[PDB]
Design a protein around this nucleic acid. Structure first.
Ligand SMILES: C[As](C)(=O)[O-]
Ligand SMILES: C[As](C)(=O)[O-]
Ligand SMILES: [Mg+2]
Ligand SMILES: [Mg+2]
Ligand SMILES: [Mg+2]
Ligand SMILES: [Mg+2]
Lengths: 168, 178, 168, 178
RNA sequence: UGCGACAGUCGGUAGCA
RNA sequence: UGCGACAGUCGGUAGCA
């Protein structure tokens, strides 16, 4: 049940990196983060991943548990980001603004450790949103750990932050 | 407001409807969502292509949902069907893809699709050039049409200067360049 | 007719580079070199190319006219060199020694600008062969130009060098 | 001379014969050439695998040349056929590939093939490990069997220390290492 | 040599180290 | 900033620049 809980958006290209072997795009990490929200009684969750991650794992962009991506798409949870090769090289469309544009227009929250310095500048109205709605995380081997104070000690609880109606 | 500053728009429906509904299902709903996006943007010239054999009742091997959405768009001079027929029990298809390209090319418009049409880029060089710079990709979020704000790489144009023929709408850039 | 002419071995991985856009593996170059020998009345010609060149053209190892390779294999002229990915990375088997080992055991000549510094050292008996049997080349846009004095002015003519029985 | 210092040898004939003759043709000649190479090297343990349906006369859709070479190698306890049969007009194949692997594994030998057996590496991890370090590839020059002198990368062993069980045969290396 | 550490070309992650 | 020129990881061609 979505008892007053918020839409959720995840920067998968950030999570998978920060989960295992930092240099590796470990899809498992995406799984662990998701399963956490699921077990937390969430319904609306969306992940973003540039599409060229389906491309077979090279040594220059290593990736593990690749089959997890298509499996999450099947549940209308994972969403790929437009990618293609123009003149033999790659065009990406910069997924970063997809994560925000979605969350902004849905009045949700972002799961990522990237501060989006570039986009805070591109649109002041976005800056405010990024300032108040970015949820960071820390990975410990095989457990999703978000902070109990997503903003500073001056900020709100974890439940009053991921819920639109606080329980006061 | 003026629509003459806008570019013609062509949509690969057989790509949209697939990518909207559980991939293996031809969900016409998406086509409606994609179009309405352009409409709200002040659009007049919009054209969709769909191989005609989709009017056939939803079979178990080629499932389709909300089938009646098609006739409503043809009635609006927006959807256009592509020739199909049965020769000796098989289907003739005429490959809708090149209808999408030929038109957008001949109208100097843009194509909406996630298919790169690699096969057609090779057959005609001038087409390749056009597809490279005039293909608009998208991403569907359940019931939300999301095109990229940078249809080409960061070095390329805005979504509006690419989706509009007069690109001179005031630009704002930073950085000292070479 | 093979009127006393020698077996021919070509370092394709060297030719294709040196033909067009030095940084590009231009298969056309292989074609031009071959066609030259063909028009010269040659029968035994063999080219070597590590197999991973069939892999689609990346920006990091660009290659053009890729379909020319399989087309030359069909004529029992092109030969691929064993390649595979062990642990996600590439193993190559170092084609260089295939070109020599073949030419040595066939008493032919090598077409390449590489001096094989490493192999002259690995086997002295090979060094002698490399010294006397390496034919260099120079590419001018779309024409195969070998030297009329494959060795120094002190050395032999082009025909007496690519033919085992000299015409004296 | 001693052959006990040698490793068991297994050959994927359906890969060799193909790659020798015009790819689409099953040229048994190659198998002979490949084997004789090992023989001249002082070999005793050599074993080949071939799906049995190759004894069927050369059909136009599955061409084969020098078919009689097969029986001669079976007669020599070198070639071994792999189970095949026709169920209801179709063929049952039993997938010769895993016969090659299981044996070489169980004999602690090496495999001669250009197929990486990716599918089998996944089914059994211990096999993957073995295939990575025990697959010997080759290259055919018309009528010449050429295996690499470095079956693994330059960092790996010689062709002989990989093709022999006792690797200690005097080594000569240069370079100061870490 | 010694094949790297580097010289050109180029990709993934970093917003200054 | 400014995204590069660079910092880590890494590939193709070079035998010393
Ligand atoms: C191994 As050295 C000191 O010649 O670069
Ligand atoms: C563009 As600058 C001088 O801040 O590196
Ligand atoms: Mg990013
Ligand atoms: Mg199509
Ligand atoms: Mg080389
Ligand atoms: Mg096989």
């Amino acid at each position: 049940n979505s008892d007053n809980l918020r839409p959720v958006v995840i920067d998968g290209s950030n999570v998978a990196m920060s989960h295992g072997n930092k240099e590796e795009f470990s899809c498992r990490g995406i799984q662990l983060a998701v399963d956490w929200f699921l077990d937390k009684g969430h319904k609306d969750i969306t992940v973003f991943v540039p599409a060229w991650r389906k491309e077979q794992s090279r040594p220059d962009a290593p990736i593990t548990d690749q089959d997890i991506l298509r499996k999450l798409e099947k549940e209308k949870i994972l969403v790929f980001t437009p990618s293609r090769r123009v003149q033999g090289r790659r065009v990406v469309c910069y997924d970063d603004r997809f994560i925000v544009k979605l969350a902004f227009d849905s009045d949700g929250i972002i799961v990522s450790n990237d501060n989006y310095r570039d986009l805070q500048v591109e649109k002041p109205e976005w800056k405010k949103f990024i300032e108040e709605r970015l949820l960071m995380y820390s990975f410990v081997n095989d457990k999703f750990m978000p902070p109990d104070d997503p903003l500073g000690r001056h900020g709100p609880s974890l439940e009053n932050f991921l819920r639109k109606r606080p329980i006061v």
